[PDB]
Design a protein around this ligand. Structure first.
Ligand SMILES: Nc1ncnc2c1ncn2[C@@H]1O[C@H](COP(=O)(O)OP(=O)(O)O)[C@@H](O)[C@H]1O
Ligand SMILES: Nc1ncnc2c1ncn2[C@@H]1O[C@H](COP(=O)(O)OP(=O)(O)O)[C@@H](O)[C@H]1O
Ligand SMILES: [Mg+2]
Lengths: 251, 91, 22, 253, 64, 91
């Protein structure tokens, strides 16, 4: 539609990021609770992020799922760009993990099944995310998972072999990322984390990881299934949702 | 709202022709779209385009003594149209 | 909680941007 | 042992170029008197533009690729303020500069370039590597006027196939799209899809809307029309390009 | 004859480009450099200063 | 020159132990690798790491009477060791 700031009421800051601030906001008619991300044109143009942002919008815009954070629209003025985004009361999973250190089996498997559902939809539309990670994972009213940020240290922890190596890739990259995420949830740090780019890269290419003692036979099995070098020996998303460990522990 | 462009004035006119002008917006603009039509008179709106370097526009072949509405839109390469500005003019 | 509207809101966002420079 | 590279290993000569991220200089390795290009990138600006990750990854990738039509990386090292790349010297500049001097290329030069690239890309595919930047500004010319792919909105968007601009699954057939855009940019001087605005550019790519100037031969038109197909499965295979009657009729190779 | 090498994911010996790698071969540079160009080669102090010059030039053009 | 850290000195000493120090490097270091070996040879060089946050390190268990070469290496996340710096010390 057509929009300007005049079309809705601004609350006060809901977090401050690299290019500007999300604020709470309400449409003047309808009275919808929504988030309003704002980005300063001059800093955007300065970092050369403008092209990337524009494509990400257009991609996100065509995805509608209770588990994928929705983008309602965008608009701009001389100095800034504005994203009408779904509000997410309970923040980022990254923040929730830095609080609790690690997550119980029940919480994790829930989070997984949400993520898997989201990605079943994406893959229905031939879209791949390639950057599923905790900083990208926002928590809903019911503590529901909303995946955000579609478009493209810890710049490589969730990446599979075939992408560090510039090789052909498919949807099985989200499955790798999912296994990485399962591990991080249960264990509190990623499985291939090393001190250096090169040592991390060494670890991923060899799928060299180990489990803390306390990790259960169930999670071990599923995580192990997901982190296989060969992408064609990773499971389908159906098989994850049907996994004994997942059924057992998901809300 | 505060919009692009900022100030839209009709700065000369005849029974059937007029010239609109505006303040060059500093923000880089690809081109301006200009819509004009008979105000609330249920004939089709009419539309043409002006290069972003230009700051005026001239319309001729209008109807004498009619109230007309003139909307200017500026277009950004990436982000689409800015919030527009409108003016009404008789004759 | 407290939803400002109008030029109050305008001032809010503008001030925030000014700050953004630093 | 385990000796590191250092600036001291090099005689530094005249600048060959000045870029977004720093200068390239002609250089000569001291023990071996090899003639090299030394790219210096400033870490400040790499951080500013957030590409340090992309760079590091592409350096690892180029280390495994050896082909006469791919620019050779020999090493890399760093300072407090710079990453350095030791590259093969390409003494005849970029095809961009050559495409500006001439406006457009004739059929013979074009097809010869396409052939060289098709080999380069067939090699990369045989190593499972895809999506190489084959834009004219990333093609250097070697000492016999052979193409060197280097890997270290104008028409940028035009070179990206629909599946990539929509975030869909993508295979080796993306390199066939790029090659068609390039073939056209060679014969014509501009890319086929560029429009006034992002939105219009994207509309054309996704709908594969474009036109040939009238001087373009039917043969060229056949090749390009097939490379620029929406459905990747429908795009030719590299061998089908190398053996295209237009290509074989016109190439030095 | 000098190079650092390591074994890969599959156990294949491949050469690390972070270390000095002697150019152990007659080079096939099919190119004559003008005397003028061959004369512009600087090593040592005079060489660090050339790049230094160009960095302070670069930085203040991007307002570093 | 062009090495990180920049100057490197043995600040202290026990008969069999020494403390080395350097200047905080401005660039961000992940960790430092510190190595030391009998400058003679026929004996293998010893290595250990120190967090990037530090600018000093102890070396213990040295032999009374031997000359040692001590090398410091600063490790960047993406790019690896900077050019190293080193120093000699006796007993
Ligand atoms: N829908 C939302 N609900 C709640 N907080 C949000 C929402 N969208 C973004 N935020 C907040 O915006 C801030 C900036 O995060 P993000 O949008 O990822 O920007 P950046 O990557 O620049 O930090 C964070 O505090 C994040 O929690
Ligand atoms: N290997 C090389 N041999 C010869 N000239 C080179 C080489 N690499 C770069 N150049 C020259 O230096 C210029 C700047 O390098 P370029 O790759 O364009 O930098 P950037 O990627 O920062 O734009 C090139 O346009 C070309 O003229
Ligand atoms: Mg712009």
């Amino acid at each position: 539609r057509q929009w300007a700031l005049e079309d809705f009421e601004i609350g006060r800051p809901l977090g401050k990021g690299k290019f500007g601030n999300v604020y709470l906001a309400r449409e003047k008619q309808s009275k919808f609770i929504l988030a309003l991300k704002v980005l300063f044109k001059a800093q955007l143009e300065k970092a050369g992020v403008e092209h990337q942002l524009r494509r990400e919008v257009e991609i996100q815009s065509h995805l509608r799922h209770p588990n994928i954070l929705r983008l309602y629209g965008y608009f701009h003025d001389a100095t800034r760009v504005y994203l009408i985004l779904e509000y997410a009361p309970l923040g980022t999973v990254y923040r929730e993990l830095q609080k609790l250190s690690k997550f119980d089996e029940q919480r994790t498997a829930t989070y997984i099944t949400e993520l898997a559902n989201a990605l079943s939809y994406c893959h229905s539309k031939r879209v791949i995310h390639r950057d599923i990670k905790p900083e990208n994972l926002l928590l809903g009213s019911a503590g529901e998972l909303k995946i955000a940020n579609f478009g493209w240290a810890g710049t490589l922890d969730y990446l599979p072999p075939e992408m560090i190596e510039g090789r052909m890739h498919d949807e099985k990259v989200d499955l790798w990322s999912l296994g990485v995420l399962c591990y991080e949830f249960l264990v509190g740090k990623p499985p291939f984390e090393a001190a250096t780019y090169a040592e991390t890269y060494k670890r991923i290419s060899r799928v060299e990881f180990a489990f803390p003692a306390f990790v259960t036979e169930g999670a071990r099995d599923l995580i192990s299934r997901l982190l296989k070098h060969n992408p064609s020996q990773r499971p389908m998303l159906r098989e994850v949702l049907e996994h004994p460990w997942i059924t057992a522990n998901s809300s | 709202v505060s919009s692009v462009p900022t100030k839209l004035e009709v700065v000369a006119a005849t029974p059937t022709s007029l010239l609109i002008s505006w303040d060059a917006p500093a923000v880089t603009v690809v081109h301006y779209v200009i819509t004009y039509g008979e105000t609330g008179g249920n004939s089709p709106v009419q539309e043409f385009t002006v290069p972003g370097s230009k700051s005026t526009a001239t319309i001729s072949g209008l109807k004498p003594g009619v109230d007309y509405t003139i909307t200017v839109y500026a277009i950004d390469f990436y982000w689409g149209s800015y919030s527009p500005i409108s003016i009404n003019y008789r004759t | 909680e407290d939803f400002r509207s109008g030029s109050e809101a305008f001032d809010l966002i503008a001030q925030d941007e000014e700050e953004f420079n630093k």
